[model samples]
Target: SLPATHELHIFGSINGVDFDMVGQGSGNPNVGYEELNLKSTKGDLQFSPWILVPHIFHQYLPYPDGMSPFQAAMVDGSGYQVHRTVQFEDGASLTVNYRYTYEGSHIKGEAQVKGTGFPADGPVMANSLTAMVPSEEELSECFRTFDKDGDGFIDREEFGGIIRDPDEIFGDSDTDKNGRIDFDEFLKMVSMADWCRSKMACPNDKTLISTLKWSYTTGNGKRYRSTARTTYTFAKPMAANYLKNQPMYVFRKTELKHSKTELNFKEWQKAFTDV
Candidate 1:
């Protein structure tokens, strides 16, 4: 959960005493040490990023007879998986979901964040941070579409297709009842989506819109929600930012390998940003 006005109030049972986890600036290093960067007001959990493809480079090493740690923790023979929670200060929390394969090139991870101190809703907050939850195919299609003229790069002209749907892609950027999707129209749309909820879109894989929704409530009880029903793709700038800031860890070769169903850093960060 991002910083807010309300204090984080935690509840748990220790021994037989009911304890509420409160915020404190100090603690013992061996016991409870202060965070170095304190980037996450909410708690963060880190596993081995390389675990996804632990044996990618060298299969020469011994092969486990059964499922590897990554497979056991991340995947089940069944199609679906489970999410585990990592708690942070001020009731900030994150949940990660992922799938691991015994022998695969990639490991898939998803994350969702929550501002525990804020009011509680089941999945609304998680949906908000990642906009327009799209699938890998969708993301590739989006990138490929704008890379027009067979050029590797997508210039502005090609990018237009992304923000506007093919059927309704062109408009003038006028605010006063103008029939164009100009700067004002663009700004409004951008702001609306920024403030609205988006399914987390990505550069690599476009997962289907998970059970995500973008919702908002005004001061006087005007509440609304949106799903990945629309086909409109976000502009590149917006999409890039989302990907870069997403709660993910870009692994270097050296990171240890541990695979479990866990949300990436990006997903966890988004939970609070969503509606």
Candidate 2:
């Protein structure tokens, strides 16, 4: 009762604009859908990138399709002609229907979009808008750069490398106000920084916010975790000659015992500081 298909093809119109797309999976070399021909005809729709077109699907789990600017429609057909609908946060909904034409190891179909509000038609990505997730690498880059000591936390002095306005970012990032920027707080900083830097406005995409919150409550500040980690030592400001920057915290190696267990945040932190 299953059709042997290696490709799924879709052809139709978006907000009355004609388009076509195709995707392959079942062990094919070239996977995923080709670039969609649809363009923005309205405001920020479908995550302000590309909108309202049918072709490839994300196979994340159940449907094996997830993420990206597109979403797989909910299936409601048991025959050749079926319908699918994708709902948006703003009550905008996309209803699609097409007649399937089966070919050898391929399924071709004609599909069109029907919906309202932003993404209903072409709000799928017309505007010059883009979604943000603040990739792990991205956050890491920001964190590691400023977190010179790398004890999985960014102290006030070290955090200075990220942005100025002093207390602003510190108060903003130290969620628990523990006087340190844990990975979670740092991530929050990155998220907000991205929004501010990207759009000049502090905003959140449901996706971005979801990512931020999910990453926040789920993870604590100990980012670097445990390892031959880049733990560190330090220098006091007043007598901490040339006492400056995150580099000053780099552990040059200090010899000790009791304090290792008492203040042992890292082997590096226990070291001596210098040029």
Candidate 3:
């Protein structure tokens, strides 16, 4: 079961084309079955108006094969196979069967869906899981998209507006005292930010919309819930600075507090102007 605010989000690629789906669990006869209303969130790939793939399970209880969702996803030979019949807008349907293989934390597989109505042959490559740190090339592409000035570097203003608190984020990312962030600095910032956010134990294989929400408990028996998001320009010079040989910030607050918080870019600057 998911948290009240969470959903079952699955992202992957089929025949080198990326696709994603989002849904939730419910008490129905088809509880374990999922319909892939697959959509392309990026690139120019067009999907059928209403694509439907059926019977893909989001296993809550461990299967008879002694594997759960995460275990079968991350481990090898867990007997987890995805069987779905994709119904397309043109009334063509394809029954695809996928047997996943775990390769270095990545789930890549082959799908056999030829005769059922797909426009392809017997087997094709597909990526079953997509929880991964951005590759250097991917990050470079992201950098180019946001580098509006063609100056080869993201200024504080540009870097701070992607998603979340700019001041703290910018201050944390910029390693050098320079006012801008280069690709190297940007890389460091993103790496550090991901590392920090990952400490919350969020699932690695999914892309979330606004925030990664989770619950955590401290050693002192204090429980707290948290949600976090990063901006587009996820790093800056300051983040690079702090991450340089500095120990990670340890959350030491023991008091239990329950209050929603918001961090604006301008206000972020005020609190972290010269950090």
Worst 10 residues of 3 by lDDT: 262-271
In candidate 3, residue 143 scores what lDDT? 77
Which parts of model 2 are misplaced by more than 4 Å?
1-5, 22-49, 52-82, 98-104, 119-125, 129-275
- What would the per-residue lDDT of candidate 2 be over residues 196-262, giving only the tens digit for each residue? 0010111221111001110111112322110011111111111212222112211111111111011
Native-to-model Cα distance after best TM-score fit, residue 71 in candidate 3, in Å: 27
Model 2 quality (TM-score): 0.30
Best by TM-score: 2
TM-score for each model: 0.22, 0.30, 0.26
Cα lDDT of candidate 2 equals: 0.34
**Model 1 per-residue lDDT tens digits across residues 176-217:** 544433333443333112222233333432221223332232
Candidates 2 and 3 compared: the better one by lDDT is 2
Indicate the residue-level lDDT of 81 in model 1: 31
Q: lDDT per residue, candidate 3, 1-275, as tens digits? A: 22111123444544445554433322111112212222224543233211212122222222222332333333333434544434332233434454544434233344443223333421111111112232354467677766877899888778755552567777777788687778888866652222111111112222111222222322333322333332111111222222232222111111111111110110000011111
